[PDB]
Design a protein around this ligand. Structure first.
Ligand SMILES: [Mg+2]
Ligand SMILES: [Mg+2]
Ligand SMILES: [Mg+2]
Ligand SMILES: [Mg+2]
Ligand SMILES: [Mg+2]
Ligand SMILES: [Mg+2]
Ligand SMILES: [Mg+2]
Ligand SMILES: [Mg+2]
Lengths: 64, 65, 149, 214, 135
RNA sequence: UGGAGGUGAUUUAAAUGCCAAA
RNA sequence: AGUCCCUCCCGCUCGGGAGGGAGGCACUCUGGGGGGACUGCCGGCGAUAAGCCGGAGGAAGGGGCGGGCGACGGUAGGUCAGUAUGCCCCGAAACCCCCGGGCUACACGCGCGCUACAAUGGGCGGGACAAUGGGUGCCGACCCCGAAAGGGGGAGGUAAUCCCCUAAACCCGCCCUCAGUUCGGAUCGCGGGCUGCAACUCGCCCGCGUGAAGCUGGAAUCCCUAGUACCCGCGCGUCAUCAUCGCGC
């Protein structure tokens, strides 16, 4: 089961609202931005957060 | 004496006492009733596009849920 | 052509046939009564197994010298059936190998490096390589791909 | 014994074991046609990379399938011709070299005795030994009953191969015949619909029982 | 004077191959490849050469040093090294395309390794267990 | 959403509770 | 691996090999740091959510694979014969030492295994390829003596340096040809050795001889989904000597 974790979602939503004009639909750009904007040390957690942020960006751009 | 080939076009679901049997829909390719579509029970792994060799083409499996 | 260019068993057979002309190679007096190791069960069946063993030892020294008695004993060991117990690996005896090496040295084919073992002399290397060349000349008539090597 | 030209054999074309071509082999049965792999290939040894994925065994050369089928003991937990055949330590399990040699010698014998391409004879045997209707069991009142069903092509191929292997294994057990000779004899008998073949008789019995319980 | 080196790995067997211009001589630890036994091992090494063709085969010399593993593991590592050396030396993508169709593992390798053993009949395997009794 | 009635059917066999708690 | 020098072999050397010294960090390896995979991309189902199914590219694809870590409680489950500990007992014996016995007995029932009942073999000669670990109360190369088990000297090693350490299944050639046998090796006789203060009760190894049941197993019943199961050997623990065991390769 590939179920996203709660704190991943929470931190991703907090980052998205704080800097709406900072993330694009590109995974690498979001990965670097997440690396620089937080104190996360685990490489896996960074990837999870960046992926969810990418999904959020493309979902809001589509307008739901 | 040699049977009739039929082609599987749809998978319905598993059945049997231990889930060993699959129910499918087949289309007759040769013989008296060529072109008709009937449902059958099959033992063994099966996928869409396979061809079965029926020894007679008048028995139809009872529908399962 | 060198020893590396021919199958081992054919070369051993040819060398064993050739070694019977060397006066210094003679089976010892206790040869007809012994086994070739504690892991065997019956006596050797060939009436001239001594020459085969000597030829094998010579080719062994050619390829892995310097080498001593103990490592050769390891090489000639094998699996033993122990009745109701599981099979196990065991080493071979020492008298056969030591006598063969001493006879080969007396023939001038090997020499002793102190503290290290025994190595092949130029005479022995020539003796082996000539037979290897002859065998390869015979062999490539039926395997044309060997003419390149 | 064996000539040096055979001990050191060098191939130059992509063909089965460097000795036989499968260009003219044809499969008559429409159902087994896409499940008998006959693509050009030199060495039939895929190192078991196919069992992981679903339907992965479809694209494995038929000769390697036979080699894997005979790489066994034979009679572990059911009786073949009225006997358990537990080979144990002397069994051929996990020795792919010996099975390879057995198959090669059997193919040589088949080609010598009939004068045809061995792969063609093998295809004919598996075509004749594959059943078309089977049965499944139900329980009522403490009694077991049979109900007739149909067989998918891949299971047909598996059953044919297993029965050929079992017949060959039974023929050489504690007799003067060797394994290669038994395999060749079984294949030849099955190709001619001879009842003395274990696989053909087994197929006939299976289909009879299935018919008598529609 | 071109010299190219390649590497192959297969379950603790390691092979290093060196390829250069030559006459068609291939040696495995100093032995000509035509004398490798048993036959099933010899055909494993020869497949990339047969696929490449006779013109390419007779124009190069290959020497392979392989250590570790067993007699079947060593042959496959040599096969991988030879295939990589061939595709790099000639540098044409038609041959590389042909190898992938025949056998992908020739170029990507095989990552399988043994699984460590576990208690309850450890010496047999990680999953085989002692027979269970109730009375 | 939650309730009250009616008509049909319902695939072999399958008994018992010692020791102990004291 | 490429380059240089010296020596020795072969078809007499155009060519092809093997050692040694210089020299090098290319390749393998060793071990610190970093990258890489996120349902990220594409098509469907579902609700447009959560997710699911199927493809591309990729060393790796959907907890990537294998392990460690076991919540609040219960089981009057096991352990006071590992250690800690209350109560009751012995307290000149139920405490402390020494000698000899026993735990190793044998009409019989049961658990887990090893060896077999043979050709998918037995014997003899020859040819190939490992990994994990361990070593100063120790590992011991190399030489000599002996038919074997073993015996007498003894380099190097407090160890990526020296040693245990040239595995077996597998391949090639010859004998045996379906037989209680050239299958099986239990049981017993004579002789030779090692450890130890001591080998009868009660140790392990070697040579010759002897040659039991067993010819595939009723009702029942166990393990296992991929480098997994089956088959084959090896290392460490225990250890003066002793492995059909445990944990690993
Ligand atoms: Mg050997
Ligand atoms: Mg045995
Ligand atoms: Mg394993
Ligand atoms: Mg209790
Ligand atoms: Mg006891
Ligand atoms: Mg015997
Ligand atoms: Mg005694
Ligand atoms: Mg018998």
């Amino acid at each position: 089961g590939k179920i996203r974790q709660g704190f991943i979602k929470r931190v991703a939503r907090e980052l998205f609202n704080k800097y709406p004009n900072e993330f694009t639909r590109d995974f690498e750009h979001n990965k670097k931005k997440v690396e620089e904007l937080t104190n996360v040390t685990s490489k896996k957690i960074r990837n999870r957060i960046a992926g969810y942020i990418t999904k959020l960006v493309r979902m809001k751009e589509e307008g739901k | 004496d040699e049977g009739y080939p039929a082609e599987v076009i749809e998978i319905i679901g598993r059945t049997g006492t231990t889930g060993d049997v699959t129910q499918v829909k087949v289309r007759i390719l040769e013989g008296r009733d060529k072109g008709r579509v009937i449902r059958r029970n099959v033992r063994g792994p099966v996928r869409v596009g396979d061809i079965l060799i029926l020894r007679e083409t008048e028995r139809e499996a009872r529908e399962i849920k | 052509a060198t020893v590396y260019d021919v199958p081992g068993d054919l070369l051993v057979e040819r060398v064993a046939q050739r070694l019977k002309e060397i006066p210094e190679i003679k089976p010892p007096e206790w040869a007809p009564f012994v086994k070739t190791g504690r892991h065997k069960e019956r006596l050797p069946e060939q009436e001239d197994w001594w020459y085969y063993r000597v030829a094998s030892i010579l080719r062994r020294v050619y390829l892995d010298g310097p080498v001593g008695i103990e490592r050769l004993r390891t090489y000639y060991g094998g699996r033993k059936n122990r009745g109701h117990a599981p099979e196990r690996f065991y080493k071979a005896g020492g008298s056969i190998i030591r006598k063969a090496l001493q006879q080969l040295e007396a023939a001038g084919f090997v020499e002793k490096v102190p503290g290290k073992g025994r190595v092949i002399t130029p005479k022995g290397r020539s003796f082996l390589d000539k037979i290897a060349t002859e065998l390869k000349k015979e062999l490539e008539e039926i395997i044309p791909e060997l003419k390149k090597y | 014994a064996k000539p040096l030209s055979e001990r050191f054999f060098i191939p130059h074309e992509i063909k089965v074991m460097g000795r036989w071509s499968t260009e003219d082999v044809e499969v008559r049965d429409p159902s087994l046609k896409p499940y008998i792999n006959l693509e050009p290939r030199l060495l039939p040894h895929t190192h078991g990379r196919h069992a992981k994925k679903h339907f992965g065994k479809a694209n494995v050369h038929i000769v390697e399938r036979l080699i894997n089928k005979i790489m066994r003991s034979g009679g572990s937990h059911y009786k073949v011709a009225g006997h358990f055949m537990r080979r144990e330590h002397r069994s051929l399990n996990s020795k792919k070299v010996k099975a390879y040699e057995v198959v090669k010698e059997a193919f040589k014998i088949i080609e010598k005795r009939t004068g045809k391409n061995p792969i063609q004879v093998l295809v004919w045997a598996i075509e004749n030994a594959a059943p078309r209707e089977d049965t499944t069991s139900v329980m009522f009142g403490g009694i077991r009953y049979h109900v007739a069903v149909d067989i998918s092509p891949m299971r047909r191929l598996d059953v044919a191969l297993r029965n050929i292997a079992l017949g060959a294994s039974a023929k050489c057990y504690r007799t003067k015949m060797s394994f290669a000779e038994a395999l060749a004899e079984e294949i030849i008998l099955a190709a001619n619909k001879d009842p003395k073949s274990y696989a053909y008789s087994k197929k006939l019995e299976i289909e009879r029982i299935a018919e008598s319980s529609r | 004077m071109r010299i190219i080196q390649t590497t192959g790995k297969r379950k603790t067997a390691i092979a290093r191959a060196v390829i250069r211009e030559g006459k068609g001589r291939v040696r495995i630890n100093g032995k000509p490849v035509e004398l490798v036994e048993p036959e099933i091992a010899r055909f494993t090494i020869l497949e990339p050469l047969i696929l490449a063709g006779e013109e390419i085969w007779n124009s190069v010399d290959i020497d392979v040093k392989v250590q570790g593993g067993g007699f079947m593991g060593q042959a496959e590592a040599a096969r991988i090294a030879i295939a990589r050396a061939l595709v790099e030396w000639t540098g044409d993508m038609n041959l590389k395309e042909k190898f992938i169709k025949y056998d992908r593992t020739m170029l990507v390798g095989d990552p399988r390794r043994t699984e460590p053993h576990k208690p309850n009949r450890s010496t047999k395997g990680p999953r085989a267990k002692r027979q269970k009794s109730y009375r």
